[PDB]
Design a protein around this ligand. Structure first.
Ligand SMILES: Cc1nc(C)c(-c2ccnc(Nc3cccc(O)c3)n2)s1
Length: 290
């Protein structure tokens, strides 16, 4: 732990704070995360074995006196920052499609190992000059528990939270990531958050206003979920034509299958990789400003 020289503060994770750092020994640059439950130790130590082209590699795990540090391979930018940098022009579809395609490859890999991310968002998706994008903080959710805020009690967003988690489902599945990726895909395309909810119920109602209030017809058992209230307003479903303009039909159809209410109806990452939308997918390089 004294072999790392903090250089900057990358961000404020939900579990801990992240820093760009240099290994005083190897002299390598890395992303250092500070955060104890033994069950956790084993939990994360298993994640260190996750090796995929689209998963931010977890190099080492350091537990020292009521403290836990995670060493990750360093990447130069998070998807949020990049999107902001392209607000005026917007990311070209070829690049969007490529990112989406790689992201799903990773998700497919993690899901085939029963591992879930559970808190996907622009900030934990990292990109390099090579045109590759990667998932960061995978599995950690399970390693611990999801709080409300953080140390600065600042803001961790519900914007990408799947409906099942918002309605109280205790045992959600890998389908919650697809939904999150689903919402992120939309944001890239429109350059705006699909569901920018400022509270749980507001987050739920925005989804409703756009996808329509769910029922037993589209979502069997929905009315029996922990937080379902028969008193929920009933809104109609709006057509994606107005949701993701100007996205082509292939992407819109692919998107609607990522945004299905019934988790068992929501498309899997593996199946999504087979969708027509990726018929002409390529790997363009981004214009990154560092
Ligand atoms: C949140 C995050 N959690 C982890 C583990 C992150 C991580 C991992 C590897 N590399 C980076 N780099 C990075 C670089 C510029 C801006 C940024 O938000 C993140 N961040 S970001």
């Amino acid at each position: 732990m004294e072999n790392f020289q903090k250089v900057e503060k990358i961000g404020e994770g939900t579990y801990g704070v992240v820093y760009k750092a240099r290994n005083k020994l190897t002299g390598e640059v890395v992303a250092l995360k500070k955060i104890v439950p033994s069950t956790a130790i084993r939990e994360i130590s298993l994640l260190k074995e996750l090796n995929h082209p689209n998963i931010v590699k977890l190099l080492d795990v350091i537990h020292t006196e009521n403290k836990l540090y995670l060493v990750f391979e360093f990447l130069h930018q998070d998807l949020k920052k990049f999107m902001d940098a392209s607000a005026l022009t917007g990311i070209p579809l070829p690049l969007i499609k490529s990112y989406l395609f790689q992201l799903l490859q990773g998700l497919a890999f993690c899901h085939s190992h029963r591992v879930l991310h559970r808190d996907l968002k622009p900030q934990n998706l990292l990109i390099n000059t090579e045109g590759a994008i990667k998932l960061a903080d995978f599995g950690l959710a399970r390693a611990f528990g999801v709080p409300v805020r953080t140390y600065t009690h600042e803001v961790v967003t519900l914007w990408y939270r799947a409906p099942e988690i918002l309605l109280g489902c205790k045992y959600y599945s890998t389908a919650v990531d697809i939904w999150s990726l689903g919402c992120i895909f939309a944001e890239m395309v429109t350059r705006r958050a699909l569901f920018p909810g400022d509270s749980e119920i507001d987050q739920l109602f925005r989804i409703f206003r756009t996808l329509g209030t769910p029922d037993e017809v589209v979502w069997p058992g929905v009315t029996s979920m922990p937080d379902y209230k028969p008193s929920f307003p009933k809104w109609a479903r709006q057509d994606f034509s107005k949701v993701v303009p100007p996205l082509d039909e292939d992407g819109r159809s692919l998107l609607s299958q990522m945004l299905h209410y019934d988790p068992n109806k929501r498309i899997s990452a593996k199946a999504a990789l087979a969708h027509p939308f990726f018929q002409d997918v390529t790997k363009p390089v981004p214009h990154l400003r560092l």
